[PDB]
């Protein structure tokens, strides 16, 4: 099993997943720590969702006789404000699309449809998340940073613990 | 209404399904009768899964105004030891892959995506079964035949009746 | 070990069952596909019943140290109308009675009563089905083909989907 | 009154049942006492099966106005190893088939079908036990004695008490 | 079509059933009327038991393209005391055995096992009812008629109302 | 290892149990067959009671490294009337007392209290069964045999079927 | 007040129990610690059983105005392998039988039956355990040490934590 070009694509996406997991998780802990507890819970969920992706890819790789790469993490764009965090996470998302769109076509050319369908679902998921992040940035401009941030705390406001 | 080439492909796969069902079911009966009753349940489930594929393909053929071929069987490979059975069953699965991979691409070129999607699912499924069979053969080597077989009996060993 | 003439008879019946299963299942899919969904469900159950028979004969053969023949199918007679299907299915059934009636007598001469009882039960089942099939034909003449067929669709008429 | 020859056959089979009951029960206790507790439970069950057979024969005999023989026990052959026990038990099962096969034919010649059916059912039951026993012997050769034996103990191994 | 000789035998037995049904039912009404209400309930059930037999035979006859005879009835022998009733009912039962024993052998000679099995089951049933009747007569002699009769009443004694 | 004298005594008692089991069970089938269905259920239970005794002794013998004797059976005395049956069963019981009383004292002399306690419990049980049997015989004389027998039937009387 | 020789015997047994409790509990912790967690659980229950015995003897002593000796322990024999542990635990057990058997006889001579019955029950318990221990050693020889040990671990193997 396992076409070297497909395996390499899968492993590169896996590296991207482990990056997203760490980045998203930390951001959610920071949001929590700042008092934005309502938002933190949401961001945390996205993190576990990438975990699910990572596992799905790991499985595909193992089935294909490859060795999953758990050694390499990508760069970490840690935001110091809500807006920076949204933008940072958006940036990871666009890169996934840039890589997976052409990747899918190749998988099908290489006659590996199972890998292709896997990546098609991930694209579908990522498009939704990208939309969510872009909508939040639009909301910040429409409402104002303070007003938007107030919708991110509880009543009364709390902290990480 | 359905493309003649797509229909010949579906009928080829259908024939392959009927062959697999008989082979898998008989193997399950033999394993059962040999005393390997735990394993036999697993193989039995596999033949019922193939029946489900046979029905799905039949549906597709009929919808395309084709005639499902229920007259033709391929050559059964009956193993006379556990290892032979895993290897015989493995042989059918690869043929399935070798056939359906070019077939899916063809179906999409003919713009029949519903038939392509049906075969995409079947391929996904067979890959999981191949991995299962290939793994059983690996375990026989790692554990040794006798030790592996002891894991396929109940406590205490039964008989099948 | 089982007597060779008994095993041959058992295997001949097994070939008959596999044929019947295919014929009946295909007929039920066709009936379903024509819109006769109420009838289709009934014919489906008949093919699963022949499955039950196939497994029982397989067990008996295996117990007698025989090798169950799953490689050979008989000739399918596929009907292109309801009446034809009833007549085609009836042809298999009379065929079984013709084979089994002398067969039982012989099984008992060879002092294999357990095989005899198995075949006695199958004969009893087939007589009931033959009666069913003959009654449907009788009803088609009495009601008329149209009126009869109307009793085989749901309200409102539906399809395989 | 019953035919004296049928009555003599029934009493003869009754003696065989009483023998098998003793032999099977003792073996089960010995297996229990050796540490083979999972196997013991199975052999104990077979012992109560023969008890039911013994009762049914007693009934038939009484109905036929004869005297059931509870005075005579056959020759017990008691195994000192598992393999010996399977062989000893199999030996007695073969005698049954040898006595009952011609016996049934004659019952029917004597026009006593109720007695014949009772014996037909017994033959059916013993063929399944013969198969179970022969399969165990076959498993001992395939797995080895120790490995097979270990499938007959509990985890952890225990004792009769 | 059934064999004409088998059909004749079946209709003879049916005539016997209808006779037994009327006789047993009337005897039970008379026993009830005399005050023997406990016994009457038992005899009534025997009467419905023959009804079931009558229906089974009717069914078989119709499946064989025969015409069930519901016009001919046998001669009732109606007892005027408990003992006479038992002796009268026993007389029908023996006639059933005298006719069915040879009948079964013939049915099997004609290739009709289903009719034979039906009759085998009836012989088994009547054998049990004969035993019951014979046992009651033995009890009357052991207990004396007065003492036996007292076991057939309720506490306190009642009537058909 | 148990003391050889204790082992001999245990096997003697076991032989007695097996004799009692057969005799009591047959007597109960005969009582049932005669119509004495209420009494039969009682005798049947006594028979299973001795089975429990037989198993306890077997267990003790095996724990002491002995070989249980399941080959030797005593002489059955089978009664042809109720009174004979009670007298026949009572005769076994007295023999048990005659053997076990001295037996217990010896067991304690040999340092084997567990075997002694087992036998003490059996003596207690048989003493109660002797009382039951002796009481039934006294009742036959007080009531008369006919009147006593009437207490052993159901209302209304039935049979073994 | 209790007899001085009885009290001494009771206290000697109490010292035996405290020793056994320690030895068995430590063995179970060691077995648990080696990975034989299934076996460990069984050995633990045995030490709690000896606790039960220790308390009963304490009660009896106190009732007889004695002073229970909780200051003295016997010599622990700690095994460094499974087989050694079984043999070490067996050594204590034969020791108890040797002490208790003559002891009981004496208790009864001193006319202290309640103390005698207490010791009779302990002897009965120990015989069962001795059988258990002897059977495990017997099974180690039959299966082999490795195969036997494998039956003492969970799936998958685990540890004391
Ligand atoms: Fe992603
Ligand atoms: Fe995402
Ligand atoms: Fe498939
Ligand atoms: Fe599959
Ligand atoms: Fe059939
Ligand atoms: Fe059918
Ligand atoms: Fe038997
Ligand atoms: Fe058996
Ligand atoms: Fe009848
Ligand atoms: Fe009747
Ligand atoms: Fe007893
Ligand atoms: Fe008793
Ligand atoms: Fe103790
Ligand atoms: Fe203990």
- CATH number of the CATH domain containing D71: 1.20.1260.10
Distance CA G27, CA G86 (A): 9
Length of chain D in terms of residues written: 161
The sign of the torsion formed by the CA atoms of G31, G32, G34, G35 equals positive
Q: What share of chain F is helix, strand, coil (3-state, %, to 5)?
A: 75, 0, 25
Residues 6+ apart with CB under 8 A from E42: F156, F158
Distance CA B18, CA B69 (A): 10
Q: What share of chain C is helix, strand, coil (3-state, %, to 5)?
A: 75, 0, 25
Copy the structure tokens of residue E1.
């079509």
State in Å: Cα C20 to ligand 6 middle: 8
- b/e string for D15-54 if b means 16 or more Cβ within 10 A? bbbbbbbbbbbbbbbbbbbbbbbbbbebbbebbebbbebb
Distance CA D86, CA D94 (A): 12
What number of other Cβ atoms are within 10 A of residue A81's Cβ? Answer: 12
Distance CA F1, CA D81 (A): 20
Distance CA G133, CA G116 (A): 26
**Contact criterion met (CB below 8 Å) for C115 and C10:** yes
Distance CA F68, CA B2 (A): 78
Distance CA A137, CA A85 (A): 10
Distance CA G7, CA G25 (A): 27
Rg (CA), chain D: 17
* Chains A, E in contact, 3 or more Cβ pairs below 8 Å: no
Q: A111 at the B interface (CB within 8 A)?
A: yes
Distance CA E24, CA E133 (A): 12
Q: E69 — alpha (psi -120 to 50), left (phi > 0) or beta?
A: beta
In terms of C-beta density within 10 A (0-12 exposed, 13-18 middle, 19 or more buried), how is residue C133 classed?
buried
Q: D68 — alpha (psi -120 to 50), left (phi > 0) or beta?
A: beta
List CB contacts (< 8 A) between D159 and chain G.
131-132, 135-136
Q: Is the peptide bond before C156 cis (omega within 30 degrees of 0)?
A: yes
Q: What are phi and psi of D81, to 5 degrees?
A: -140, 165
Q: Which of D113, D115, D118, D120 best probes binding to E when mutated, by most E CB atoms within 10 angstroms? A: D113
Q: A108 at the B interface (CB within 8 A)?
A: yes
Using CA atoms in the order D93, D94, D97, D98, what is the torsion angle rounded to 10 degrees?
Answer: -140
Return the closest-CA partner of residue C112 out of B159, D91, D105.
D105
Task: Find the residue in D nearest to F30 (Cα).
Answer: D62
Return the closest-CA partner of residue A7 out of A119, A86, A90, A101.
A119
**Contact criterion met (CB below 8 Å) for G47 and G21:** yes
> How far is the alpha carbon of B158 from chain A, nearest alpha carbon, in Å?
34
| Domain containing residue F42 | 1-161
Distance CA C77, CA C89 (A): 8
Helices (H) and strands (E) in chain D, counts: 5, 0
Q: Do C105 and E111 touch (CB under 8 A)?
A: yes
User: Can you say how many angstroms the Cα of residue B47 is from the centroid of all Cα atoms in its chain?
Assistant: 7
List CB contacts (< 8 A) between G142 and chain D.
34-35, 146, 149
Distance CA F102, CA A85 (A): 96
Q: Do E152 and F153 touch (CB under 8 A)?
A: no
Residues 6+ apart with CB under 8 A from A153: A35, A36, A37, A38
Distance CA F58, CA F10 (A): 8
Least CB-CB distance to E114: which of C102, C105, C127? C127
Return the closest-CA partner of residue G44 out of G22, G26, G28.
G28
Distance CA G89, CA G49 (A): 14
Q: Which of D127, D130, D134, D138 best probes binding to C when mutated, by most C CB atoms within 10 angstroms? A: D127
Q: What are phi and psi of C109, to 5 degrees?
A: -70, -40
**Contact criterion met (CB below 8 Å) for C46 and C85:** no
* Residue C26 CA: distances (Å) to CA of A122, C29, C54, C55: 39, 5, 17, 20
For C92, how many CA atoms within 13 A lie in the half-sphere containing its CB? 31
Residues 6+ apart with CB under 8 A from B126: B93, B96, B97, B100
For chain B, the chains sharing at least 3 beta-carbon pairs closer than 8 angstroms are A, C, D
Place of tokens 């590169």: A12
Place of tokens 């970490």: A76
State in Å: Cα A54 to ligand 2 middle: 11
Return the closest-CA partner of residue A57 out of A125, A141, A130, A116.
A116
Number of folded domains in chain G? 1
List CB contacts (< 8 A) between D113 and chain E.
101, 104, 120, 123-124
Q: Do B147 and D147 touch (CB under 8 A)?
A: yes
Distance CA C17, CA B33 (A): 21
In terms of C-beta density within 10 A (0-12 exposed, 13-18 middle, 19 or more buried), how is residue F105 classed?
exposed
For C109, how many CA atoms within 13 A lie in the half-sphere containing its CB? 9
Q: A105 at the B interface (CB within 8 A)?
A: no
List CB contacts (< 8 A) between A114 and chain B.
120, 123-124, 127
Residues 6+ apart with CB under 8 A from F74: F15, F16, F18, F19, F92
> How far is the alpha carbon of D99 from chain E, nearest alpha carbon, in Å?
22
Distance CA A14, CA B159 (A): 47
Return the closest-CA partner of residue C29 out of B73, B51, B115, B58.
B58
Q: Is E30 among the annotated ligand-binding positions?
A: no
Residues 6+ apart with CB under 8 A from C139: C148
For A160, how many CA atoms within 13 A lie in the half-sphere containing its CB? 10
- DSSP conformation letters of B68-109: ---S--------SSHHHHHHHHHHHHHHHHHHHHHHHHHHHH
Distance CA G47, CA G45 (A): 5
Q: D113 at the E interface (CB within 8 A)?
A: yes
Residues 6+ apart with CB under 8 A from G34: none
């Amino acid at each position: 099993q396992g076409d070297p070009d497909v395996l390499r694509l899968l492993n590169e996406q896996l590296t991207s997943e482990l990056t997203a997991i760490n980045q998203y998780f930390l951001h959610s802990k920071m949001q929590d720590n700042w008092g934005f507890t309502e938002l933190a819970a949401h961001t945390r969920a996205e993190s576990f969702d990438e975990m699910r992706h990572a596992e799905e890819i790991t499985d595909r790789i193992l089935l294909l006789d490859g060795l999953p790469n758990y050694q390499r993490i990508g760069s970490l764009r840690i935001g110091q404000t809500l807006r920076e965090q949204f933008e940072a996470d958006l940036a990871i998302e666009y890169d996934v699309l840039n890589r997976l769109k052409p990747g899918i076509v190749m998988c099908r050319e290489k006659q590996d449809t199972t890998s292709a369908v896997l990546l098609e679902k991930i694209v579908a998921d990522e498009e939704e998340h990208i939309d969510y992040l872009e909508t939040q940035l639009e909301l910040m401009d429409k409402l104002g940073e303070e007003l938007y941030s107030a919708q991110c705390v509880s009543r009364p406001p709390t902290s990480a613990w």
